[PDB]
């Protein structure tokens, strides 16, 4: 579909006190790939990023309308954003376009700014909130998402085995698609640290 | 239908475009230019619905040339590529939308060489070489088999010839003579321009 | 185009209108919409003309042979089969809205019904055509079991009337049928 | 109107000597149905013009109320002057042309018939604009039926008397009872003379049906 | 999809991948392309599984019957040929089926590529396929008829290697075939990812 | 109008084994937003080493059934022998492009026992073309159950996971634990499960309920 | 998608399943389809579900700016019509199904609402796409005047029957009593559904996954 | 859907079924099909539901604002008149099937309808809805000039039974609306 | 069939214990117009077996028919062998098939329900050859309406009686009068027990508006 | 779509296609033949639908050497021509079309030279110079100045080339080398291959 024309697949895993997010590198057009860098996961602050799937124009444009609200909040208010703000901010810049609809799949994850806790939700393409507690996914991808996390999800996770059960069903789910390959990128984050890895993926 | 391709260097940028107006059966004009000589360090390329191309050039030329008689300083490549991919993704949703395929060349005294790619959805993207129409196919395999990204620009000249006469071999096209640019410290240093006997 | 066939005691009686409409011009004015087919057995035909028109005959040549085969009177039922027969496996083409009626020796008056699907019910009054829906609106008001046989021709007087004077593809004339043991009488109310 | 919803049907208008007269009837269908059988479709315009019309009855409501408050204004300027029946055909000609123009048209077909001033005028509007003047007109199917009798006897004829043209009108509105599925037996004459504007009561026709005792 | 076939001196190079998905959902990496004919004979599956199956196996028995009615092993030009009229009956119901016929000829080296469509012809270098493009330049640059036979097995591979790179519908193990002469041998059956980490660097 | 097909869904899941062929199958047969049963197994066992699984449009799937058990009897009533397996997956093939032009909408997975005893599972697609894999799963179910079988069976993309061959009962406790997984997130799957084992020895089978909405 | 209303002998008992499914596969097995719209009413909705979130804050956030202006408690009859003059004002392009009930000075009063803009004053309505199981629940056993615990056991069966039929919702019922004093909200109300235990531990472990770039960033 | 108008010496009265279907499923087995405007004017709706609800909101408004002020009663013929203009003005976009009727001081019981178009006609009796035609069908066959009160009811009652009867979108129950000078009775009824 | 003229509406069935109750109505609507208000949708075959079915009625005469021969053929065969209700299950199934792989599809929805050898039987015919056995069957609405009820009563019992089986479809059947526009206040119970087949007269139901006095 | 020519002569007849086996895109075959032998004096050349070319060369070139086995002669190139024109028209009309571009050359004893030409829906010709596909449009007016009934066969070969060498210039397609017949008293006599080197 539209949504399958450049592909995509975001999967975000809340763990224990931390949470995962995780994407694919590809870009291309509808069978020709272009390149192998190009960057879905958006820093949002500190401590909470951004994830989209779709068609990469609304990906970039949504990526920057929402930095250019975010910068204006932050300066007219001296705090960061907590999560739901955020989703509530991402919900109404797509509400806008009610019936010029953005082609996009957010995904925000973060943590608590005052304590740790953890948080995911996902949105629609037209601004439908929905919060859960294990995962949740976006993209051409789903089901294949859906049933690796539904295999192998367990709720009170340090951060390694977090990584590797999000590693595992990235991998898998992304083997078994075809146009989004390429390269897997995997963002753990944590109270104290910020990770970044990128794993092994095959390149066929 | 047809296509200009770019390579980057490690302080070079390697575009080379077509001299092909052709329209629907007949060349009408075998001496063509698609090269955009935006400022001093940066060019532009441009494929696609000819009604749209020059007032690309029109818009986005004039309009970064107002920049840098505004302000004192020319623009980064990075910002310039930013700017053209916000304006299409602004005129692609209205009554009037634009179809064209771009590619910018530039280098910047910090960054150094930087090549992007754009499309007819306006994405950015940051790549080593691109691709558009169907040279893109017949260029982008072998111009993968042979990369190095620490090559120097004779040895990125070679490589390009093979490529064109690989091109002229198995098209369905003409494409005669192509026009190349290079990128360096200096700035834009026309090549010899590249036409081939075929036989 | 207004077709309507109510049973009594003794036999059963008929009626319908004349006019033949194409859009919204008449072509004829004056029309035989029910036909004989045995000389105890009529239909009225609806729908379309040319149809209709080749079912009857087919109808009647199968009929007439099958009723000197046997040497005996038809039956009214029969006739019902044959055109459910005609109707049902070559339909998809055709616009029948035939109503079979007809008095027998062996059951006296009987009334059948054949719309455009191809079905087969036994009714004892029956409507038929576009403009019989108002007068099916109230045929169940102002029908009583048992009449005799003014007042079922007085019935489909005030019936056709009404679907003549309302609907605009009805008009014309009142072709009135009588069939019973005794004979067939048939008469034209007009103006 | 892009669909029409109630249709009336053909209207019949002729010149005479010091005269037109209008007859259309009172029929209101709707698809099939003749749901309004008792209905006007002529207005009687001021003292000189009046109007008759076909096609959706609604919009002929609108024109009668627009028309009505143009009359009454210029009547209450107290100048003395008056709309001739040529100023209301081309009035409505051009708001008929402006409606079509913005692709809304009004669906109707509609006859002029006024006298002013020694001079007989009929005059005929269409939806689409087209507009004419002509001794005799005949809207809808008329103009397939009942228009070779008023070509003929014009014909044969070119002046008529009053008491020749309604004859003319009858047997006309009589052929038309016998051949248009949209027909109904109760019409309404109007007459302008310079005596005023008269508009007479729902006559009927009288038919024959003896052919039907043939087979 | 990509396959490639291609004669030269020491018989024929036949390679293909594995992968045949289903719109945007890949069935399996395994399934095996390049259709045993005969042992002298190859043929490949190139848009379509089951025409091609179907086909090509309808082909061998129709060939095996020529074989025990002459005493004698059958042409490739006659396969082609023979292959052409059964699928030109068809014509425009709806079959896909770009195949590649290969074989030993009397005359020696034989490389016919019929369609769907029918377009019935000999030549010298093939590529079949959405990514077929990809293996004509990466090909056509290394191309010569004077090659040896391990510099032809590196060709091939590095062909199906950059068009499983490139293009999204093939990948999965690239298997190797090599006519000769006299019969048939399968070379291997490498994986991309094997392919991946040995010509990356 | 009258539209020939209909999609009725369903699950169909096979294991290739050392010595034994699973095929299990849920039996909930529905129709767009209803549920028309709850016992509806996909699974029919044709000979004593052979079982078929048919899902996608349902009363193909039926008249597939019965022509391949007539087929099976023809042979027999010929030949004086039972089918193989792969006889019996070339024949299937051979009927489904034999109605090429109209075509079956049915998945079907044949699993079983080889000549030398061995599991064999056949795959197919609707328009006839098949191949030996390990497993498949087939009908709606099959994206969600696929990478699952990835990582499991084929110990894929895995780093230092050495390969044990796959037993018997942690084979059972494989499809117990994808049908749950599956029936969590599936729409089409639910409220049973048909378990059939084929062995050197005949014929098992096994129901094991599931969540009943 | 199964809710329902009712009318006991004093307020309104409504109840909702919760599964919001995206085509064919179940996306969520929590989802509050109960908005709130003031302290006495509420507001279930049906179909697209972001345009009856936005409406039903629109409404919601109109009403509490009337009656902070105003000063007392809200009527129904008031957001009954606002929601139906802008819905019809959207000439039924926004596909909102919803189920309006609140308990004013006037008593109880329930109000079905179409995407159209046409609304209906019901003592039980049904809505959505397993709509008809409970509808059939209530024709079968609804008397007038119904006691709590009696209609609370009903709404229960009626979207138990829901969810028995398809597309109704592993969530295990969402319920919600209002009356002219106590306002309660239930999420949590009965499981039947189990899932059940895992018969592998597939873990993933320490070290399964080749790594290429590492990248350590520490924070505050 | 079934909606029904007659008007008598001393004033009018309504009636009407309930039954508001959405396609073959009832949404809804009672509904008030008629609406109160002023406290002596009614009307009753058909074709779609939220088209006729907006467009009586919106009468209601100008013709209660109008009558105050006014300071006296309304009269019949400027409600219909503004259901006229209302209808016409988005008679691309509407299916209106109001009809009006109610008691005026100076004219007595009146009823007009307005169809699907935007016409405007005053009537004796008026029909409306789907299930129309079949009442239709006979109420030109019962009425009789001058009835009573009574009368009136027992008619209605009649004519909205055979339709409920025979319609299938048609049924529910019946309710009737008694408008006079003296005051507003309405009842439920079945049978 | 391409296009159903005159359709029935939903027929309900459901086993007990040694016995199986099918009723439906006597409705004969075409497009909403109920043309037909007496016809008998339910054939009794000839000891066992019994038949119900839906959409087009005449598909479902010349089924009646055909079934009707092949019964009288195999009674006429004198052997003392007969059609068990599953094996008329079979033969229907594949003449469902047979139409619809040609593009001539029976436009039907047929319930089969018979008792024999102790054993009952309730199998559904679709129009696609979509076939199984079930405890309760629910056709057209009815699998949307009366269904739920079904399932509630043999979860929460297993097996049943004949009284509690009859009242059953008595209340499935006053809900489906309730809310359905195509449904009719006169239905018929047709029973089959070892002792035979019985076909109940014109039953209808007890209906309820109280609902009706509130606003 | 592809091209190929037909000149006439007094005493020759002198055709030439192209060697080009394209697939919308790439090239698939670069020597490709489109010439079908038939008889000693008569050639046939086919454009069109490459599913119908091979079959109705296939048909043609295997009955007419039927003929030519029965009767123990040769037909004339009129016959052939129009037998070919018959089996096209008959096969219009049903539900097996053929979408194909003859051009037949021939030589009799007699009548000495001749050219015939057909078109996709079966029209005879009797030509002084005839083409196909969208060359035509160009390679038509380049030749119908210089052409002359009298004409030698090294003019003509040289009018070949100041043809080719028009066609080559502005043109979309690429059309690399063209192969040569011709006949004359004896017979079929191949010239050299044509091909060009262009810049």
């Given at each position: 579909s539209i949504m399958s024309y450049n592909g995509g697949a975001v999967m975000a895993m809340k763990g224990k006190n931390c949470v995962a997010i995780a994407a694919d590198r590809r870009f291309g057009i509808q069978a020709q790939m272009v390149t192998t860098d190009f960057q879905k996961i958006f820093p949002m602050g500190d401590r909470l990023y951004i994830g989209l799937a779709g068609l990469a124009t609304d990906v970039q444009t949504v990526a920057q309308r929402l930095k250019f609200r975010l910068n204006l909040y932050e300066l007219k208010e001296g705090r960061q954003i907590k999560p739901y703000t955020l989703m509530s901010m991402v919900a109404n810049l797509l509400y806008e376009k009610r019936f010029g609809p953005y082609y996009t799949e957010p995904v925000i994850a973060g943590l608590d700014p005052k304590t740790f806790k953890p948080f995911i939700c996902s949105l629609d393409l037209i601004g439908c909130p929905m919060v859960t507690d294990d995962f949740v996914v976006s993209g051409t991808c789903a089901e294949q998402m859906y049933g690796m996390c539904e295999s192998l999800w367990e709720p009170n996770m340090d951060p390694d085995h977090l990584f590797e059960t999000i590693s595992q069903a990235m991998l898998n789910a992304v083997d078994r698609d075809a146009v989004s390959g390429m390269g897997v990128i995997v963002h753990i984050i944590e109270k104290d640290k910020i990770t970044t890895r990128t794993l092994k993926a095959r390149m066929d | 239908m047809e296509y200009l391709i770019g390579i980057q260097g490690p302080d070079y940028v390697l575009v080379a475009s077509d001299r092909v107006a052709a329209s629907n059966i007949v060349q009408m004009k075998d001496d063509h230019d698609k090269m955009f000589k935006m400022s001093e360090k940066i060019l532009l390329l441009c494929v696609g619905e000819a009604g749209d191309t020059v007032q690309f050039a029109e818009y986005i030329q004039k309009n970064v040339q107002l920049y840098k008689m505004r302000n004192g300083y020319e623009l980064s490549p990075t910002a310039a590529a930013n700017f053209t991919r916000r304006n299409l993704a602004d005129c692609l949703r209205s009554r009037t939308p634009y179809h064209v395929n771009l590619l910018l060349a530039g280098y910047d005294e910090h960054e150094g060489p930087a090549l992007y790619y754009m499309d007819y959805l306006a994405a950015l993207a940051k790549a080593p070489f691109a691709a558009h129409g169907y040279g893109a196919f017949l260029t982008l395999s072998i111009l993968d088999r042979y990369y190095t990204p620490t090559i120097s620009r004779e040895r990125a000249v070679e490589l390009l010839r093979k490529c064109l006469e690989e091109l002229q071999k198995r098209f369905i096209l003409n494409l005669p003579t192509f026009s190349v640019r290079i990128i360096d410290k200096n700035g834009i240093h026309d090549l010899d321009n590249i036409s081939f006997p075929k036989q | 185009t207004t077709i309507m066939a109510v049973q009594f005691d003794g036999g059963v009686v008929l009626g319908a209108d004349s006019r033949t409409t194409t859009g919204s011009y008449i072509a004829n004015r004056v029309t035989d919409k029910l036909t004989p087919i045995h000389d105890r057995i009529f239909c009225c035909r609806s729908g379309s003309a040319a149809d209709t028109q080749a079912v009857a005959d087919a109808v009647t040549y199968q009929l007439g042979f099958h009723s000197i085969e046997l040497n005996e009177p038809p039956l009214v039922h029969t006739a019902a089969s044959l055109f459910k027969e005609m109707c049902y496996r070559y339909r998809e083409d055709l616009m029948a809205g035939i109503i079979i009626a007809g008095w027998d020796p062996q059951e006296g008056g009987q009334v059948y019904s054949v719309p455009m699907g191809g079905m087969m019910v036994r009714q004892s009054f029956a409507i038929g055509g576009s403009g019989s829906s108002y007068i099916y609106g109230y045929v169940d008001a102002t029908y009583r079991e048992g009449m005799t046989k003014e007042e079922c021709l007085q019935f489909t007087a005030n019936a056709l009337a009404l679907a003549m004077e309302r609907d605009g593809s009805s008009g014309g004339v009142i072709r009135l049928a009588a069939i019973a043991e005794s004979g067939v009488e048939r008469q034209v109310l007009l103006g | 109107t892009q669909n029409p919803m109630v249709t009336g049907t053909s209207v019949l208008g002729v010149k005479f000597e010091g005269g037109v007269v209008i007859a259309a009837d009172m029929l209101g269908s709707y698809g099939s149905l003749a749901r309004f059988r008792n209905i006007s479709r002529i207005m009687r315009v001021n003292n000189s013009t009046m109007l008759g019309a076909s096609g959706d009855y609604a919009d002929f409501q609108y024109l009668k109320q627009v028309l009505g408050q143009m009359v009454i204004d210029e009547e209450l300027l107290g100048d003395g002057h008056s709309y001739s029946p040529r100023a209301i055909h081309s009035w409505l000609t051009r708001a008929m042309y402006s409606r079509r123009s913005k692709m809304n048209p009004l669906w109707n077909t509609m006859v002029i018939g006024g006298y002013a001033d020694g001079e007989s005028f009929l005059g005929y509007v269409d939806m689409l604009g087209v507009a004419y003047e002509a001794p005799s007109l005949a809207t809808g199917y008329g103009a397939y039926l009942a228009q070779p009798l008023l070509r003929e006897v014009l014909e044969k004829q070119p002046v008529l008397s009053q008491t020749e043209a309604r004859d003319l009108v009858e047997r006309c509105m009589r052929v038309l009872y016998y051949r248009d599925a949209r027909s109904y037996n109760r019409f309404q004459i109007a007459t302008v003379t310079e005596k005023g504007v008269e508009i007479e009561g729902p006559l009927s026709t009288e038919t024959n049906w003896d052919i039907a005792h043939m087979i | 999809?990509?396959?490639?076939?291609?004669?030269?001196?020491?018989?024929?190079?036949?390679?293909?991948?594995?992968?045949?998905?289903?719109?945007?959902?890949?069935?399996?990496?395994?399934?095996?392309?390049?259709?045993?004919?005969?042992?002298?004979?190859?043929?490949?599956?190139?848009?379509?599984?089951?025409?091609?199956?179907?086909?090509?196996?309808?082909?061998?028995?129709?060939?095996?019957?020529?074989?025990?009615?002459?005493?004698?092993?059958?042409?490739?030009?006659?396969?082609?040929?023979?292959?052409?009229?059964?699928?030109?009956?068809?014509?425009?119901?709806?079959?896909?089926?770009?195949?590649?016929?290969?074989?030993?000829?009397?005359?020696?080296?034989?490389?016919?590529?019929?369609?769907?469509?029918?377009?019935?012809?000999?030549?010298?270098?093939?590529?079949?396929?959405?990514?077929?493009?990809?293996?004509?330049?990466?090909?056509?640059?290394?191309?010569?008829?004077?090659?040896?036979?391990?510099?032809?097995?590196?060709?091939?591979?590095?062909?199906?290697?950059?068009?499983?790179?490139?293009?999204?519908?093939?990948?999965?193990?690239?298997?190797?075939?090599?006519?000769?002469?006299?019969?048939?041998?399968?070379?291997?059956?490498?994986?991309?990812?094997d392919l991946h980490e040995k010509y990356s660097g | 109008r009258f539209s020939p097909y209909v999609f009725n869904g369903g699950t169909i899941l096979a294991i290739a084994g050392e010595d034994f062929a699973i095929v299990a199958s849920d039996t909930r047969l529905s129709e767009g937003f209803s549920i028309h049963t709850r016992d509806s197994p996909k699974c029919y066992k044709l000979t004593d080493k052979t079982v078929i699984g048919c899902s996608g449009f349902h009363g193909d799937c039926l008249t597939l059934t019965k022509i391949i058990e007539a087929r099976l009897k023809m042979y027999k009533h010929s030949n004086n022998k039972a089918m193989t397996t792969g006889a019996i997956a070339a024949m299937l093939s051979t009927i489904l492009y034999s109605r090429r032009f109209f075509p079956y909408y049915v998945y079907n997975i044949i699993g079983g026992l080889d000549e030398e005893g061995k599991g064999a599972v056949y795959s197919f697609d609707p328009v006839g073309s098949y191949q030996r894999d390990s497993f498949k799963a087939g009908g709606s179910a099959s994206a969600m159950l696929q990478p699952l079988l990835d990582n499991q069976v084929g110990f894929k993309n895995m780093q230092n996971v050495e390969h044990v061959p796959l037993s018997l009962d942690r084979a059972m406790r494989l499809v117990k634990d994808v049908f749950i997984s599956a029936a969590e997130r599936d729409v089409y799957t639910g409220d049973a499960l048909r378990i059939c084992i084929v062995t050197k020895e005949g014929i098992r089978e096994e129901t094991v309920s599931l969540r009943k909405d | 998608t199964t809710i329902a209303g009712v009318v006991y002998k004093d307020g309104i008992v409504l109840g909702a399943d919760t599964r919001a499914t995206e085509g064919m596969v179940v996306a969520d097995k929590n989802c509050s389809k109960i908005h709130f719209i003031s302290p006495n009413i509420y507001c279930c909705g049906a179909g697209t579900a972001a345009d009856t979130d936005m409406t039903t804050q629109l409404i919601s956030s109109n009403l509490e700016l009337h009656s902070l202006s105003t000063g007392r408690l809200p009527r129904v009859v008031t957001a009954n019509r606002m929601l139906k003059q802008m819905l019809f004002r959207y000439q039924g392009y926004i596909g909102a199904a919803l189920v309006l009930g609140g308990v004013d000075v006037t008593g109880p009063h329930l109000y079905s609402i179409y995407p159209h803009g046409s609304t209906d004053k019901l003592p039980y309505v049904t809505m959505g796409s397993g709509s008809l199981a409970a509808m059939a629940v209530f024709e079968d056993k609804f008397r007038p005047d119904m006691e709590e615990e009696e209609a609370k056991n009903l709404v229960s069966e009626a979207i138990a029957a829901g969810i028995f039929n398809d597309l109704g919702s592993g969530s295990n019922i969402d319920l919600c009593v209002i009356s002219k004093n106590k306002l309660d909200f239930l999420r949590p109300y009965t499981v039947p559904n189990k899932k059940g235990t895992r018969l592998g531990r597939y873990r993933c472990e320490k070290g399964t996954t080749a790594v290429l770039t590492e990248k350590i960033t520490p924070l505050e």
């Open positions: - | - | - | - | 999809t990509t396959t490639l076939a291609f004669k030269f001196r020491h018989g024929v190079i036949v390679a293909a991948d594995s992968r045949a998905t289903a719109g945007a959902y890949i069935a399996s990496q395994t399934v095996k392309k390049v259709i045993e004919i005969n042992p002298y004979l190859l043929g490949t599956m190139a848009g379509g599984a089951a025409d091609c199956s179907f086909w090509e196996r309808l082909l061998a028995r129709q060939c095996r019957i020529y074989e025990l009615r002459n005493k004698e092993r059958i042409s490739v030009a006659a396969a082609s040929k023979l292959l052409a009229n059964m699928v030109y009956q068809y014509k425009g119901m709806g079959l896909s089926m770009g195949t590649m016929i290969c074989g030993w000829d009397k005359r020696g080296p034989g490389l016919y590529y019929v369609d769907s469509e029918g377009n019935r012809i000999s030549g010298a270098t093939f590529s079949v396929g959405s990514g077929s493009v990809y293996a004509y330049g990466v090909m056509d640059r290394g191309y010569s008829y004077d090659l040896e036979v391990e510099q032809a097995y590196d060709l091939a591979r590095r062909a199906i290697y950059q068009a499983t790179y490139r293009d999204a519908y093939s990948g999965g193990a690239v298997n190797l075939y090599h006519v000769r002469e006299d019969g048939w041998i399968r070379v291997s059956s490498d994986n991309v990812a | - | -």
